[PDB]
Design a protein around this ligand. Structure first.
Ligand SMILES: [Mg+2]
Ligand SMILES: [Mg+2]
Ligand SMILES: [Mg+2]
Ligand SMILES: [Mg+2]
Ligand SMILES: [Mg+2]
Ligand SMILES: [Mg+2]
Ligand SMILES: [Mg+2]
Ligand SMILES: [Mg+2]
Lengths: 386, 386, 386, 386
């Protein structure tokens, strides 16, 4: 009954099930989890692997000696469980030194420190076998207009990512970068606030082939945007390197609900798209078990993430395989959308009198699109009424 | 007292002061304006020029004979007033044939018709001396998930813009295209919903140098985004070809208030940015005089657009020239943001022990950014308290 | 298979399936429907009844003679089909005279005209057997701060509703009023913008027992509010006289999607609440078939409204009847929420040392709420995985 | 130059300038402030008084002995400075025991504990001379639909407030309660989410005269609502007992910016309303100095709160005193809005043929409202261009 296996490629951040429940108005409600027990519990639930910030695994300020001991304990748990580490990232947001950003801090010495902290963790990520390195610039931004010249900040952001790209190519590392956008919180406005802004920025880097996006369901929805549409544009550009799955109820603070919560129909269309397009990367959950929950609720919440993906996967597959849906797709002319507008070329189009001079505009306008019948078949499939 | 002259490059769409006041719930409250009287009245107000949709100037369905007479009347009014036409665009949204889009309609024959309708108006725009041709894909989108395969739609959108680019280069026209993003309305979700999505899409076109963005204040604010930040990224990419100025009160329907209304502080930071960066294109107002107004209120509203720009221009210039503000900018290290993070290169950075091993993280964290004092000086300048 | 019957009390506005598809940017895509054919088609679909604005049934400006003929045709169709008319309302928003409002227009003569137009339709509504009279003040509001003194406007709004209440009591009519809130559109801000504001206003009227609320799914969601929570407060106050069912995708223009579209999980919790609380009024759909659709799509969209309600009704009933869910409700202490905090009284509470002096705050804090397991059971029931 | 004095009645929460800068993603950037030094520094800035949560003044878990010493130190600083304490409140949100709420927690023993914790602080507030006791139910709410039966929760909320009202009347205390609404954060949805919901709830309490609202600028704007409109309705109902002043940039997390930041024009219309209506309560700032700031930035931010109020007060007064504005108000018929619609009564209205039968609807519709000229005069006054 919708049981995950490591072949489903479900992954979790250490910081997700490990979130102690401290929010802007309240103290932690759960004790800290040992990264080793998180790996063990996730493996029993059917997870494929885990991800980490440097500071999740190695407490900030650790000596090189303690650092080695933390990695060895972690590596032993991975060996014992068969869990993989497909992605890693840097914490450039918790420590007070990053209060005005890491890569785009106004202070130059902070920017240099941020780069050195990142490079150190890239080495560790490669050693653990990570294939994607995520950058979430949570402190890159501003609360007021004069605090940040955004053109200069984008220069600094490009400089930082270009240097990271020079570092991985000079070391011969087989790792790629993924930028994770977020529109706001904790800064009043964050630089590169949506998937689109991040995709546009990547095209200005020196080695654009090394960089893609790591979109998160809830973050695009914090701007009221259609997440499946944004994912489709990232896939269209060949830039969907990784994805963060969770839930969000509209435009408000970043909720990080378990996947399937929040906008359920958007979750259906997302799974339909990822499975149809053959996305083969990790299905990563960046979620927070609500601070109302004890540790039993943490693992129930994590299990629910994977369960909801598998239920939606089944429903989307039944939707696409239904002959009546295939009939409805043709009635709405989805087949015609996939055909070129003018494969005959510009000159043939200009000479084609049926495209303008003799085009019956009233007859074309009278054709219904039959979209509502199609959408109700999708609803019926989602709800199990077909 | 803040009087505009044609040297200020203020322009208005015919459809702005010409809006009759029909909204989704109500009939028109004003009679239609002759395009010739709009040109005359705007010239008396100090405007530099006007813009038009094809269907604003030539009523849909006009014969070639009536078309010639409409253009000649319009050209005579331009000659009589000295008004310019710096931009033109196509109406691909009003007629029922465009109910599922123009360039990305599911029906192939509609897509071909949309291209022919656009090409015809490009010829006219060039004849009138327009330098920028704007495309607002208001019907390109969907209300439901299955109605539009977004990857196929982006293929169709790229095909359409590539064909337009082939057309202007083969004709030898000196005109460039600007895509105007909008996140929603009238479609449930519109393709290329923000400046970022449009910038990313442009980089996939065959001749990207021909295409830029035409951002609108209110449209980015309909996604809760920081409009000056988005403009800065467009300037950083070299893609700000045109701009639509107006006002918007938050995330809701597209209000198109007169410029300066809505988010007043964002308007200040926008003008500061455009003037500092030396933007030399038209200051175009895409606004709607509220349907509460008679024709006297229409011209008062249009005059207010230009007045508010000139007041904000004065205040932003006083802000940047104030020695105390220049002192505060250095106190907040805006000068350091403009300096390279690592002009010494990657290897020097890796060997620099002051960037990590010997970096005093507690001393750097204790430095205040002094952003609040800087922002209050900006407030004082905006309010005329300095 | 989820077939509606008139016993389900599904009703539709004439203006819903009759919407011609004119939006702020486009002309109508469908021809006008005769109110008589709408009644016939809805009856065949299983609807219980219809609702109307005065101007939906009797074209504005009609003579008393034409008025009588329009009512007689309509009454004959009701007799032929068995359809009821449970609710009626006034159009105080389409005609230009209402551009600054009806009851709160700045012009006194418009306010008097608005009252007379309303009173005339109350008489007709009573004659047709309507039990609820809805008031949606779509033009009561402002785009700018100085245009409307809101305290004076609330005086005028109270005066108007008090006069309507005096009229129905003096005539001996058995009809009640329901105020329909909306936060914005077509005005920049609308007075009484949410269910809460309307409930508070009602308590200041001379005869508060005559007035309740007519909340609409999409309107509360245009403020990002939880619609089932707002309905619960209206039920708690005894003021849910009527309800408008539809769908909305977040904070944007009023979409009026078919019910079940938009926020699907909120639709589930709404149906669960209405059915558990024993709401016995009409299930009214205020929706607009998208303008992409021809007339076949209109009736498919209307049928989908009722189908989705019946599917959700089945799923919510299975959720509440599931013994495992009843167990989970007790594990989350929903039973304790229903028990008085201090039925022993204030003095016993003050003397109860187990409530403070000897309360084990750490042991209470450690109890998990088990909310995530409960919410996943709700998800499983909604998706038909149980 | 816009200097505050204690006669301006500016007050600050201890938790405002005392905020250490811990946010959901980052550690504190400032050390804790002694409440005594906050009182001294605020007095030097011209503040009138301070407010506190119980846990701001007396650390949680303090013995009665330490409690007495904390109050005595605080009282001495008030005596030394002349600072007043006009308002106090309870922290029912930080400690883990309150993770599912205080007054509406599902666990009955937590609800009883919450009441006892509140009653203890009411005694202290009265001893310090507070006139208003604020309740912000930050944890009263839910992240999921089944976790909270909202009708039962409203019963529990009414029970709690009724008991507090019985307590203050039985003790003979001269204190009133003010409910502070917030739509979300830290809960997914918070009960009584707006001013309207809180006003409606108050009317169901046993002694409604004891309860009013404490609206906060940013909280109503988190629902996209017009804050001056909501304040006007609270004033109209006689329920504006207190107010929280700050700034917010649209629909997102609760920013608590200094007053005047965020929506500047809404701040102008708010001050215009408070001063015109003769609001005589405290001008309380509930704001957070951004965590980018050191302690010098904290006091600059607090000073900016008061400065911006005084500048806006001057501009609103000049606006209302300008003869040209008074002329424009009559041109827009604000005088007619203040006059009764039908002081002649219902029967005279029904017999008045000029209100309907002979009303010239086309002539009334043609009248412009002149709102745009009025709004530009307001803009000119705000910007100091008049
Ligand atoms: Mg998130
Ligand atoms: Mg993430
Ligand atoms: Mg617009
Ligand atoms: Mg525009
Ligand atoms: Mg609606
Ligand atoms: Mg409605
Ligand atoms: Mg706040
Ligand atoms: Mg507050």
């Amino acid at each position: 009954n919708y049981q995950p296996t490591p072949e489903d490629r479900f992954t979790f951040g250490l910081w997700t099930v490990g979130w102690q429940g401290r929010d802007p108005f309240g103290d932690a409600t759960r004790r800290a989890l040992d990264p080793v027990e998180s790996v063990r519990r996730l493996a029993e639930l059917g997870a494929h692997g885990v991800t980490f910030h440097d500071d999740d695994l190695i407490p900030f300020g650790s000596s090189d000696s303690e650092r080695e001991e933390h990695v060895k304990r972690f590596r032993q748990a991975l060996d014992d469980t068969g869990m993989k580490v497909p992605m890693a990232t840097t914490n450039l947001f918790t420590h007070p030194v990053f209060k005005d950003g890491g890569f785009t801090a106004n202070d130059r010495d902070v920017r240099r420190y941020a780069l050195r902290k990142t490079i150190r963790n890239i080495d560790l990520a490669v050693e653990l076998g990570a294939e994607t390195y995520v950058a979430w610039g949570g402190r890159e931004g501003a609360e007021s207009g004069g605090a940040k010249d955004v053109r200069d900040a984008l220069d600094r952001m490009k400089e930082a990512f270009d240097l990271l790209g020079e570092y991985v190519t000079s070391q011969g590392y087989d790792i790629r970068f993924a930028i994770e956008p977020k529109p706001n919180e904790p800064r009043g406005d964050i630089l590169l606030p949506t998937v689109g802004h991040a995709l546009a920025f990547i095209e200005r880097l020196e080695r654009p082939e090394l960089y893609g996006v790591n979109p998160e369901v809830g973050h695009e929805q914090m701007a009221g945007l259609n997440f499946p549409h944004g994912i489709a544009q990232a896939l269209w550009a060949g830039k969907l390197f990784h994805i963060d799955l969770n839930g969000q109820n509209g435009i408000k603070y970043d909720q990080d609900l378990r996947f399937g919560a929040g906008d359920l129909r958007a979750a259906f269309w997302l799974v339909d798209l990822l499975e149809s397009a053959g996305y083969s990367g990790p299905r990563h959950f960046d979620f927070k078990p609500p601070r109302t929950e004890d540790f039993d609720g943490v693992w129930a919440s994590a299990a629910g993430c994977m369960r909801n993906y598998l239920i939606l996967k089944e429903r989307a597959a039944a939707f696409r395989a239904d002959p009546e849906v295939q009939e409805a797709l043709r009635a709405s002319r989805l087949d015609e959308l996939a055909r070129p507008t003018a494969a005959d070329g510009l000159q043939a189009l200009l000479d084609d009198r049926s495209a303008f001079e003799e085009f019956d505009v009233d007859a074309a306008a009278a054709r219904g699109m039959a979209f509502e019948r199609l959408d109700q078949l999708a609803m019926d499939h989602l709800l199990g009424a077909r």
